[PDB]
């Protein structure tokens, strides 16, 4: 009898949301449906374009039920408030959506409550202004969850999906595969934070006050995550957005999506995570996440930058180009905070900088750099990361680089932190080395025969080449 | 230095309505003044405008219904950061 989706997000060991409020920006909703009646407040805020009743409140009601519905919801307790920014045909405007976002912030200022989660189950093309409003609303301390989009396309081309400082959600089906349906389906790529159930999801139907319907979409996927977030913020109300994002990732099912469904270039960029509720099993833990930059573009002096959230430390930095036309990467300070910067080669199509960002309080981290000598540098403190760059066109707490390259070590003062280094080499398209269960990958790099790049995938270090050696740095309390 | 943006997905564009975004520290009183200055400069040129909304609390600025003919004029108003043409969003 349990819907496939509510079982899927249930963790392998297990035992809400009322202190938290969830705002929904959507169509009108049928607030008297028995799934949600008394749990949702309709604000009667409305800003929608003209067309060009059962059907009018269909989309929204279903999602309100997914978030908070008493029989089929994720966060069966939670309080909701709805704003109407989509018309009866499911259409809205950027301007209207801003006015809605703005309404939420004003409400909050006038009658402050607890943590807020905002579900944005909608998408248009890339919008400078909409991404900015989202960012600003996020910095004011509000959590935003949005749909990746349903176009079987790179989510960075759509807003709010592409909007910085927002949890963006793609959709998977009962077989844990990305939803694809003809030319439509889940969006993907590096602006997608994680996936969640988004096919055949049962919830409240506005046909009648006790009816149910299965609907599919990245909105449905995002709604599961808003619910999960409402529960997470009820248990730990002081969570920052960054702490919350690190928890969603850590508690996700990993390596369960077959990445063959996605275009070749987006596979590496797309996170293989399916959202889940936190376990009854939970003391402090080291959380890290992998952050891909925008592609640097082909300019000769191009740089890609990967940044962490304000309350995270950058513990390592690597890079990747599909061509292998690369001048590597370096950790550089910027507004008193370290960022990961990667350098394109003359004639390269561009490169990605790939950060490892971790929640590490009490860390005092610095960078130790040595110019071309092979080249070596150490923490004279634990080593958490090696990076390397060169300026030429071609070729024990210690980093070693190429004799012609500069080498950079990330060194942290973190008592209570243990790190070890694990090496693996072979004759080869991809070499791989994983931290042991209970350890957190902090750094991933290749020993210096021509490498395309290296990247952390969860707690596995991947090195891609055209006698290659993967090197993983792993830490724990 | 003020720039213009509109949606790359052409069917989703909604010409004739524009979001005028002002620089970060601009005060609500200034946003309002800038909108009126715009309407006035437009009226002198024979153009009707309608100020639909004045933004404050997240971004300063305003939403305006006008002919795109006026964009060169609007980009030169004081305090303007950028202007974006309105566009469509859809339930997902």
């Amino acid at each position: 009898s349990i819907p496939w989706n509510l079982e899927r997000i249930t963790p392998p060991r297990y035992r809400g949301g009322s202190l938290v409020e969830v705002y929904l920006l959507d169509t009108s909703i049928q607030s008297d449906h028995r799934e949600i009646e008394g749990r949702v407040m309709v604000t009667d805020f409305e800003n929608v374009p003209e067309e060009d009743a059962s059907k009018c409140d269909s989309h929204g009601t279903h999602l309100a039920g997914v978030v908070s519905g008493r029989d089929a919801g994720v966060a069966k307790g939670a309080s909701m408030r709805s704003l109407r920014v989509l018309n009866c045909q499911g259409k809205g405007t950027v301007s209207g959506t801003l006015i809605g976002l703005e309404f939420i912030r004003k409400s909050q200022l006038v009658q402050p409550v607890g943590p807020l989660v905002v579900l944005l189950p909608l998408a248009g093309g890339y919008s400078r202004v909409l991404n900015a409003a989202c960012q600003r609303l996020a910095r004011a301390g509000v959590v935003l969850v949005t749909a990746a989009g349903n176009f079987r396309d790179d989510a960075c081309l759509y807003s709010p999906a592409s909007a910085p400082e927002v949890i963006t959600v793609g959709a998977t089906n009962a077989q844990d595969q990305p939803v694809t349906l003809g030319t439509l389906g889940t969006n993907f790529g590096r602006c997608v934070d994680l996936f969640a159930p988004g096919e055949d999801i049962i919830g409240a139907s506005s046909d009648c006050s006790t009816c149910f319907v299965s609907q599919s979409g990245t909105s449905q996927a995002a709604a599961h995550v808003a619910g999960i977030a409402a529960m997470m913020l009820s248990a730990e109300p002081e969570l920052t957005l960054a702490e919350l994002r690190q928890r969603l990732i850590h508690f996700s099912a990993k390596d369960v999506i077959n990445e063959a469904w996605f275009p070749e270039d987006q596979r590496v960029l797309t996170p293989n995570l399916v959202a889940a509720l936190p376990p009854s099993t939970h003391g402090w833990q080291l959380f890290c996440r992998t952050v891909w930059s925008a592609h640097s573009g082909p300019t000769r002096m191009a740089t890609a930058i990967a940044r962490c959230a304000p309350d995270e430390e950058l513990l390592s930095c690597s890079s990747f180009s599909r061509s292998g036309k690369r001048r590597g990467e370096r950790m550089e300070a910027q507004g008193g905070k370290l960022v990961c910067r990667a350098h394109n080669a003359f004639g390269g199509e561009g490169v990605y900088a790939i950060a490892r960002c971790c929640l590490l309080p009490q860390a005092n981290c610095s960078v130790h750099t040595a110019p071309p000598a092979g080249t070596r540098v150490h923490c004279h403190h634990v080593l958490t990361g090696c990076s390397s760059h060169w300026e030429v066109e071609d070729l024990p707490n210690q980093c070693v680089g190429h004799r012609e390259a500069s080498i950079h070590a990330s060194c942290c003062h973190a008592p209570g932190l243990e790190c070890k280094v694990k090496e693996h080499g072979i004759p080869q398209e991809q070499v791989t080395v994983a931290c042991e269960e209970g350890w957190t990958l902090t750094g991933c790099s290749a020993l210096p025969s021509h490498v395309l790049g290296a990247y952390a995938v969860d707690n596995t270090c991947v090195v891609r080449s055209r006698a290659v050696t993967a090197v993983a740095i792993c830490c724990r309390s | 230095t003020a720039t213009f943006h509109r949606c790359a997905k052409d069917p989703w564009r909604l010409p004739g309505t524009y979001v005028v975004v002002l620089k970060e520290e601009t005060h609500l009183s200034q946003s309002e003044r800038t909108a009126r200055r715009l309407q006035a400069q437009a009226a002198r040129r024979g153009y009707l405008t309608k100020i639909l909304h004045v933004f404050h609390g997240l971004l300063p600025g305003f939403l305006v219904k006008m002919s795109g003919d006026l964009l060169e004029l609007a980009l030169k108003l004081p305090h303007v950061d950028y202007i974006e043409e309105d566009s469509s969003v859809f339930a997902q």
Binding site: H59, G90, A123, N150, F151, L181, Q215, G217 | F90, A91
Partner: peptide, 9 residues
């Protein structure tokens, strides 16, 4: 679907 609405159209 145009565009990706109501269950993948």
């Amino acid at each position: 679907x145009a565009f990706g609405x109501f269950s993948f159209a």
